[PDB]
């Protein structure tokens, strides 16, 4: 399997030959398919990462914003892979480690830079961990659940007012739940009784869809996002503030069914240059097919991504409608 954490499991591959595995966290690659083990089962919190793995793995791998019991029955060893954020692994562990049986292996696998040393003080109680050596800028940890502890998920729901807006979150939407200056750039382009369906497609917690439907009411709302915790916080966030609007999980418009009058989304910054030109290619190849006659794609994005040649490649050409010291919101039309 391809990342470095997956890496660092697989060097030590004996020792998970005889177990019957509970794979959870960040599932970037398909290690949790392809590694051998007595039984494999998985749980994410990503729709992308879920088709993957069920695609080879069936109904052993699982997709929801809360694990159950049933989701981790029969599973003897955890192995759990570091997220970004550490509300978001707060959640998951506690919501894992809830449900395992007392005397669960425990592995966590991550990068140092990503916070992973933050697993020891928040398993302390629970599942002492002891770091297992490892490539210098990685942190292998291993533990076996001594008390499980009691997990609640309504007690992680955040809530909050910005703008006259309220605004429902929860841990996984680390970055994607408020007025940031991108969306702001992006709403000022948009004019107030704007008709039409709309589809927001970088979800998050919807904050975009409820400032746009405050000025333009008649909209239809359809939004979508990759994340368990953002698809749920969006609906909240949307019942929150009077909206109507049909929200699912999608991988960018894989469940995308129909045409719109207009798409707009504020994508996540990037990390590479591979990453970044993959994700600006399937958001705008699967916007062309997509859209009404004559209907707008919108994007905010910090002006060094390249959007504006897959934009031309896409439609021919693109315009520029706003611009700030970082971001550009680009419009191209059908």
């Given at each position: 399997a391809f990342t470095p954490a997956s890496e660092v499991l697989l060097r030590h591959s004996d020792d998970f030959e005889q177990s019957r595995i509970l794979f959870a966290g960040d599932?970037?690659?398909?290690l949790p398919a392809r590694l051998d083990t007595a039984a494999s089962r998985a749980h994410t919190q990503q729709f992308h990462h879920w088709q993957v793995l069920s695609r080879q793995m069936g109904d052993n791998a699982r997709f929801s914003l809360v694990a159950t019991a049933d989701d981790v029955?029969?599973?003897?060893?955890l192995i759990y892979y570091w997220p970004k954020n550490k509300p978001e692994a707060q959640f998951q562990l506690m919501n894992l480690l809830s449900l395992l049986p007392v005397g669960t292996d425990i592995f966590v696998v991550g990068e140092n830079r990503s916070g992973v040393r933050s697993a020891e003080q928040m398993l302390a109680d629970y599942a002492p961990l002891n770091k297992v050596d490892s490539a210098r800028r990685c942190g292998l940890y291993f533990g076996r659940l001594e008390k499980q502890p009691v997990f609640d998920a309504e007690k992680f729901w955040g809530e909050y007012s910005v703008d006259g807006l309220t605004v429902k979150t929860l841990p996984g939407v680390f970055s994607r739940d408020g007025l940031d200056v991108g969306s702001q750039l992006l709403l000022s382009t948009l004019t107030p009784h704007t008709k039409g369906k709309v589809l927001d497609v970088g979800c998050g917690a919807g904050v975009l869809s409820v400032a746009f439907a405050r000025?333009?009411?008649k909209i239809r709302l359809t939004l979508c996002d990759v994340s368990a915790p953002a698809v749920e916080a969006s609906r909240a966030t949307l019942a929150a503030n009077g909206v109507e609007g049909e929200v699912f999980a999608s991988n960018v418009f894989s469940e995308v069914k129909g045409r719109f009058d207009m798409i707009i989304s504020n994508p996540p910054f990037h990390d590479g240059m591979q990453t970044s030109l993959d994700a600006a290619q399937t958001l705008i190849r699967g916007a062309v097919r997509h859209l009404n006659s004559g209907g707008e794609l919108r994007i905010v994005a910090?002006?060094?991504?390249?959007?504006p040649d897959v934009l031309d490649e896409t439609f021919g050409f693109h315009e520029v409608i706003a611009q700030t010291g970082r971001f550009k919101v680009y419009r191209a039309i059908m």
């Open positions: 599932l970037q690659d398909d029955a029969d599973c003897d060893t000025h333009s009411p910090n002006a060094f991504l390249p959007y």
